[PDB]
């Protein structure tokens, strides 16, 4: 029917930071991933429970489009099952995961010259994150048996660190915007489908 | 270069609030508060981030110190409602990449000079 | 409670070659020092944001060294105009400024 909206997803001038990942429902589109499958902009196109190929013709019951950026070395965190400091605590895929993850350099377009520091990380948190949940909370946390009393003192830390992006460096520290397309909910009639 | 400039009150008389604040340059750079005073060491009161607008003090500034964020111009207002005699001290607005600890300041502010006339 | 205590207080060198400065900790420091140049009746500025690793301004001549508990700081080039109070700064923990080394002319 109408057109997909799934052009503004991936062409949004900002993402916001993974801690807060904006999560884009997706109603009213139609499914024409052979633009995104025939793109050579997109250096990891990794899905994982459906085949890259099979996106252009398959009906989808709801979808959501999770965005963020990541830093150039270790982008594959995401993966599930894959556990660090940004998949811990910043954004966790679940186990079993039901979507395609599409990460591509974006070193020209979020990587700005002596850096850009507008995404963070939560680097510290009291327990690893749920998985597909965002955590907002930004108290002190509390590394020392003295309670911090929502104050940031000796063994008191912020939660929340900041990512060094700078153009000079290459493989090791570039902007890698990640989204994340998890669909396939099975819990409705399906709104998403692929053109006839 | 150019440090971030700030304005702040000086010579207010005992019980006063001072009201003084910095103009940040742009993002979610971190603004921490240190506190000098004269000739002594450093000291540091706290730090609001301008984007997130969180609260962040110092057990031995906790309550004496209020910070207030106006996101229009992007400014972070610092209110000190208790003064003492010896709490004359240049309250110094530093600019530092937001961490779990108040990280390098880059770069400092312009330092406001407040005195307390007894 | 760290206390980033630093032992020549009153370090004091005449304009030359080599200049010595040192900074310590009371616990173990993950090699996150900075130096802060304290002019007299100035804001100050950072010096080396890294442990060692000078900043993007102009401080050419000037090198930070050490990791662990010990710190110290050598500068080639010994102006009049350099010469200032430097403020070793941990941030391994939590902010922890120590008392401050003065520089003089002796």
């Known amino acids: 029917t109408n057109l997909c909206p799934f052009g503004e997803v991936f062409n949004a001038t900002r993402f916001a930071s993974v801690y807060a990942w904006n999560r884009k429902r997706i109603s009213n589109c139609v499914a024409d991933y052979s633009v995104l499958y025939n793109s050579a902009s997109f250096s990891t196109f990794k899905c994982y429970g459906v085949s890259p190929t099979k996106l252009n013709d398959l009906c989808f019951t709801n979808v959501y489009a999770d965005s963020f950026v990541i830093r150039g070395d270790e982008v594959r965190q995401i993966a599930p099952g894959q556990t660090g400091k940004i998949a811990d605590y910043n954004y966790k895929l679940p186990d079993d995961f039901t979507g395609c993850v599409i990460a591509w350099n974006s070193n020209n377009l979020d990587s700005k010259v002596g850096g850009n520091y507008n995404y963070l990380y939560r680097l510290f948190r009291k327990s690893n994150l749920k998985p597909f949940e965002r955590d907002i909370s930004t108290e002190i946390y509390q590394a020392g048996s003295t309670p911090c009393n929502g104050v940031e003192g000796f063994n008191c830390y912020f939660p929340l660190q900041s990512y060094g992006f700078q153009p000079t460096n290459g493989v090791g520290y570039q902007p890698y915007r990640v989204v994340v397309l998890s669909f396939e909910l099975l819990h409705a009639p399906a709104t998403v489908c692929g053109p006839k | 270069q150019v440090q971030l400039v700030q304005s702040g009150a000086e010579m207010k008389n005992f019980g006063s609030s001072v009201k003084v604040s910095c103009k940040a340059s742009?993002?979610?750079?971190?603004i921490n508060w240190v506190r000098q005073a004269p000739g002594l060491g450093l000291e540091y009161m706290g730090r609001?981030?301008?984007?997130?607008?969180?609260?962040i003090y110092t057990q031995k500034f906790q309550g004496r110190v209020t910070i207030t964020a106006d996101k229009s111009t992007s400014t972070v207002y610092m209110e000190l409602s208790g003064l003492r005699s010896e709490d004359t001290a240049v309250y110094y607005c530093?600019?530092?990449?937001?961490?779990?600890?108040?990280?390098?300041?880059?770069?400092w502010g312009q330092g406001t000079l407040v005195t307390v006339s007894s | 409670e760290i206390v980033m205590t630093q032992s020549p207080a009153t370090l004091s060198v005449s304009p030359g070659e080599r200049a010595t400065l040192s900074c310590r900790a009371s616990?173990?420091?993950?090699?996150?020092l900075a130096w802060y140049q304290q002019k007299r009746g100035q804001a100050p500025r950072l010096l080396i944001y890294?442990?060692?690793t000078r900043a993007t301004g102009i401080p050419a001549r000037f090198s930070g060294s050490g990791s662990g508990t010990e710190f110290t700081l050598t500068i080639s080039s010994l102006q009049s105009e350099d010469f200032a109070v430097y403020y070793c700064?941990?941030?391994?923990?939590?902010?922890?400024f120590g008392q401050g080394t003065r520089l003089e002319i002796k």
């Open positions: 530093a600019r530092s990449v937001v961490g779990p600890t108040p990280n390098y300041f880059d770069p």
């Open positions: 742009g993002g979610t750079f971190s």
């Open positions: 616990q173990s420091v993950s090699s996150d």
């Open positions: 700064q941990q941030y391994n923990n939590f902010i922890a």
């Open positions: 609001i981030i301008p984007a997130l607008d969180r609260a």
């Open positions: 890294g442990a060692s």
